[PDB]
Amino acid sequence: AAPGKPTIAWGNTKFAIVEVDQAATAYNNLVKVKNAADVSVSWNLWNGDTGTTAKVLLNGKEAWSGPSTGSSGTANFKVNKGGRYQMQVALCNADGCTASDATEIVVADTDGSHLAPLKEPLLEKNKPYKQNSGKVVGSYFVEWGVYGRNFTVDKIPAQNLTHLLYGFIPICGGNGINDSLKEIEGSFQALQRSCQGREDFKVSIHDPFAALQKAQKGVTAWDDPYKGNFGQLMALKQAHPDLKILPSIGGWTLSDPFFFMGDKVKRDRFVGSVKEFLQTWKFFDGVDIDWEFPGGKGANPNLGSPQDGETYVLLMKELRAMLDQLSVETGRKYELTSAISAGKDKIDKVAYNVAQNSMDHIFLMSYAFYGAFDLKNLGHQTALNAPAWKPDTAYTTVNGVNALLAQGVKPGKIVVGTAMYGRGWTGVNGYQNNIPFTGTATGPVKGTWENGIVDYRQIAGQFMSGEWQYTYDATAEAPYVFKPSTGDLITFDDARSVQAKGKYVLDKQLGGLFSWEIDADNGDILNSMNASLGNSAG
Amino acid sequence: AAPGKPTIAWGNTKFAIVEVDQAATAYNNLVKVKNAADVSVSWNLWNGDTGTTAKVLLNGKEAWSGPSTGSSGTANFKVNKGGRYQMQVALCNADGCTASDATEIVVADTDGSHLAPLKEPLLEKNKPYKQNSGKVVGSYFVEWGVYGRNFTVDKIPAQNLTHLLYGFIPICGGNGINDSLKEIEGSFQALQRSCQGREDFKVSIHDPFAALQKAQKGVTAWDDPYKGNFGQLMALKQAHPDLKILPSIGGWTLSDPFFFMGDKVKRDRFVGSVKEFLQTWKFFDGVDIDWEFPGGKGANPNLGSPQDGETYVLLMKELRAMLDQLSVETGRKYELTSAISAGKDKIDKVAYNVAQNSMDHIFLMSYAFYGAFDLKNLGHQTALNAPAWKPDTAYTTVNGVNALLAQGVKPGKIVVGTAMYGRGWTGVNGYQNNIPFTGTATGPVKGTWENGIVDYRQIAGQFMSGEWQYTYDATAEAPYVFKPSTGDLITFDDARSVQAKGKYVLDKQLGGLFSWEIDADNGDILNSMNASLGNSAG
Numbered sequence A, B: 001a002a003p004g005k006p007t008i009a010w011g012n013t014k015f016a017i018v019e020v021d022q023a024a025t026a027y028n029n030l031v032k033v034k035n036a037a038d039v040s041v042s043w044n045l046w047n048g049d050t051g052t053t054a055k056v057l058l059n060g061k062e063a064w065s066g067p068s069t070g071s072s073g074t075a076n077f078k079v080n081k082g083g084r085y086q087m088q089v090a091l092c093n094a095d096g097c098t099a100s101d102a103t104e105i106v107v108a109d110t111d112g113s114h115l116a117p118l119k120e121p122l123l124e125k126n127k128p129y130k131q132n133s134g135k136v137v138g139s140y141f142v143e144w145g146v147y148g149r150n151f152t153v154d155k156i157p158a159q160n161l162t163h164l165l166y167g168f169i170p171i172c173g174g175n176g177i178n179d180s181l182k183e184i185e186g187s188f189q190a191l192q193r194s195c196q197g198r199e200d201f202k203v204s205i206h207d208p209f210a211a212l213q214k215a216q217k218g219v220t221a222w223d224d225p226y227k228g229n230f231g232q233l234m235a236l237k238q239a240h241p242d243l244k245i246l247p248s249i250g251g252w253t254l255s256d257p258f259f260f261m262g263d264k265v266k267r268d269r270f271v272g273s274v275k276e277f278l279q280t281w282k283f284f285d286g287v288d289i290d291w292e293f294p295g296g297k298g299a300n301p302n303l304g305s306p307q308d309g310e311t312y313v314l315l316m317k318e319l320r321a322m323l324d325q326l327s328v329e330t331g332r333k334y335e336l337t338s339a340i341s342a343g344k345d346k347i348d349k350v351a352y353n354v355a356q357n358s359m360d361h362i363f364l365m366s367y368a369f370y371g372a373f374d375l376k377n378l379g380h381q382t383a384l385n386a387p388a389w390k391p392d393t394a395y396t397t398v399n400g401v402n403a404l405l406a407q408g409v410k411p412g413k414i415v416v417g418t419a420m421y422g423r424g425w426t427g428v429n430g431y432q433n434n435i436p437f438t439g440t441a442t443g444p445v446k447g448t449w450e451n452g453i454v455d456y457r458q459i460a461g462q463f464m465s466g467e468w469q470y471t472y473d474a475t476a477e478a479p480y481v482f483k484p485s486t487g488d489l490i491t492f493d494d495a496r497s498v499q500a501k502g503k504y505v506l507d508k509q510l511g512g513l514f515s516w517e518i519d520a521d522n523g524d525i526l527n528s529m530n531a532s533l534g535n536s537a538g
């Protein structure tokens, strides 16, 4: 007669292809990529003949087989594809095979194949849009926003985006390489801990706790291998297979390392580490380079060289070559983007007409044109055009787009920036004809998280009432609120200025719109980005 | 400044003092009693000075301490008491100690200290009673009832009992020692597998899957160490701290080994294994001996000796001595009981007037007086008295009680048996004056699970309607149903006969009532046991 029916032993059923060390703070030790997950299963036979061969099946297919030598057995084998499997133990003899009931086993991987789709309801004022315009609709999500700002991946209105960028992936390096981090308490040290034993110029993760270990919706079980932002992004990719999720390298305080990349030894090491990062974290779809900025004038006053433009063009061509190789290895399309200054003095330091051939999209940072960093020359921080009182204004969106077009950049590559936050000053005084922008300020406006910067949510929630004046400048295409008693002035984007940017993109055949930063919107800004580009509601 | 605040690493938080091998079918390998659980905790420090000393606290008390030498650490230590603890990791230096948030850890033990109370709602017709009569209200639960009968520990109306007996714990032994098991397919083999490598005459668990591994309400997590009947009984003891839960050794098919216990070498080995079993499974409160029966005439026709009475008295005295020692070692009260034949021919083979001094209670099996085992001499199987048509009837409850009293047994030791099932015959014919008990039968009645035996639930649900006659014999104090067309006759207890037994117990100052078997009642029988003994509703 056939063997008796085995009973699968109680035991762990959760396994991973990319293992995470739960007691590691250095990136080198934190993740281990294997070619396959090590899986184990045991069984007991409470009644009958134990058979002569025991097998482990996954969805009916043999993953292991060996001699059946007693009432209990154990099998160890490898599983090289992530997902959930119905696993059975079958005992066979010449008279037949008898299979156990199935037990589900989970085989984790960083594409999120083991995870349920994170498909959460839209919050605040976000309304549903269908990405059918063919235009980019992007936004940045910040790693550290999960703490005070309490804005996690399950709160991103993901169906309303084509591109979701993660700021920021740091480049390892200590003294003289990431000195701009020292301006932020504990930040430089944090990177040195993450990069312990790791060469400089290789990428890492700045805050491994936020990126991978903090419990978040959908990834709360103790043995869920990937938690934090990366575990939720993987689940988000299961929910939105076409959303492009790009890791952004750099930003204001993590850009110093780019200034050393004129040394091809360092550049090659960096590019190779980006390739490894994408092989490790499969939910990511390319790389965004946010170098602020070629030529200097970024956070570090001691960096910047006339050689930076060349280095930027080389870097893009080599990134593209690496991504093209990864692309054919995997059958996937990988994207290469960059967030750049929108000021013509900085644009002119790079030959974008050449670099564009390596890039899918150029995220023109048409924001922060003005702000509390300059208390004497006030102006709209993210306007489309110059204002009527100063038609010579250098820093406007159109001027940055025009600088790119004048180099020969194709219009379709250019993605216009929208601000989901305002910049502002306090004590504004000595202005003429009721236009506060003609005076000078005494300091920054009180921000939501930091001086001189205010979330759009707070502008709409608190500064559109009481003594606050509201004006929409139709020449510049920019809103601003002003409190005459304290002289507080805030410049930002609102639904109408975003609609003007969107119409401008469609008229000039530009690539779409992107924003900084997603946690600060209440929905009004992203709704307008979507509507103004022609995306159908629903 | 004090050290930074550590983050407890994700990891297993469930540990056990008595470990269970998930891939073991032999009792020797299945459970491992340790003096303490091996616990482990790891931690990372994402910000700050790591301190110079790291400590693991349980409810604020140090369980481990060692030098803090880096950003991550691991501690291994022992916990010798079951329960749930709030565990913290603190990093200290001369300037202060900084403790992590707490993480609960579970330390399992077999008293059920790690489990939530299994306090389930009464089902079917069971109504709530308060054990305030001072009388025993007992019932047996069968290990194998969790399969076809689907009657699990969460279905026991536990608040309505003083004593819950578990049938049955087997005594290891193969050929010539447990031959009565061979009458049940796979049963003898099952015991040989459980007892592999274990000496004969030591106790074991007959079906380890039902007793410890089958998922049941309250004990379904893969890493819950104790599942099955024993895990639920532990949780039941957390819910009913005063309920006495006794393991019963023997029964109809596991009694053969007792017949060899005239050899003190074997008897001592048995008693020592009972002590070990109670040290291992702390939720149990003593031991019930169900030897059927001293003198033979049990399942095995080749066993029985005139020496059995002596062996029984010795066994009880030695069990009592072992329990008295365990009792003072633990501060607990342990009970020693026995289920015995109620026929005077069998009672007379034992000097109960002597054995009673070692026993807390005598469970008089005043049932199975008659049944399909004898097709020619029909009669009430569990009546209080003889019927009017045969006032010389030997097997009645009163006669068994009277045999005990005549030896000198104290009335308070005697617990009267009630049947939660009926016995019956088919083809009953040749009876006079409409009393079916005067005829003879052609075979057994069709049972619920086995021939000639019917659950009371089924008697009430199916055989109290249609062609079935119902009669209550007030002389005997016994109900019976009869189907004249097929000649099917069933004898059992009902609420009224149980009330007569209960009044009899109170009148004669007996110890209380017990029943066989709890899964077969729909609530009517246990309700009456409780009411008739004077227990207040509620």
Ligand SMILES: CC(=O)N[C@@H]1[C@@H](O)[C@H](O[C@@H]2O[C@H](CO)[C@@H](O[C@@H]3O[C@H](CO)[C@@H](O[C@@H]4O[C@H](CO)[C@@H](O)[C@H](O)[C@H]4NC(C)=O)[C@H](O)[C@H]3NC(C)=O)[C@H](O)[C@H]2NC(C)=O)[C@@H](CO)O[C@H]1O
Residues within 6 Å of the ligand: A140, A250, A251, A252, A253, A290, A292, A339, A340, A341, A342, A343, A365, A367, A368, A369, A370, A371, A373, A374, A375, A377, A395, A516
């Ligand atoms: C003496 C003084 O008055 N000098 C003035 C100049 O400083 C000034 O030009 C503006 O200069 C500031 C630097 O202080 C600069 O603002 C940095 O701007 C970048 C964007 O280009 C920001 O970075 C990106 O966006 C967010 C923030 O918006 C970053 O946090 C993120 O890392 C980056 N990524 C993305 C995708 O957004 C920096 O955050 C920001 N830093 C500070 C300190 O604010 C403006 O870009 C400069 N503007 C131009 C047009 O160059 C000049 C012009 O107003 O006036 C001089 O007087």
Ligand SMILES: CC(=O)N[C@@H]1[C@@H](O)[C@H](O[C@@H]2O[C@H](CO)[C@@H](O[C@@H]3O[C@H](CO)[C@@H](O[C@@H]4O[C@H](CO)[C@@H](O)[C@H](O)[C@H]4NC(C)=O)[C@H](O)[C@H]3NC(C)=O)[C@H](O)[C@H]2NC(C)=O)[C@@H](CO)O[C@H]1O
Residues within 6 Å of the ligand: B140, B250, B251, B252, B253, B290, B292, B339, B340, B341, B342, B343, B365, B367, B368, B369, B370, B371, B373, B374, B375, B377, B395, B516
């Ligand atoms: C030739 C023939 O006709 N002989 C008749 C005799 O057999 C007979 O006496 C009765 O004999 C049967 C044995 O066949 C016996 O029934 C065994 O009874 C015990 C209880 O005493 C049962 O065991 C316990 O209870 C349940 C069952 O009710 C068990 O399953 C459990 O293991 C035990 N524990 C508890 C707590 O309950 C046996 O299950 C049962 N076995 C069978 C096969 O049914 C009766 O006890 C005998 N009665 C007396 C008074 O001795 C005799 C009397 O009717 O008639 C002869 O003719």
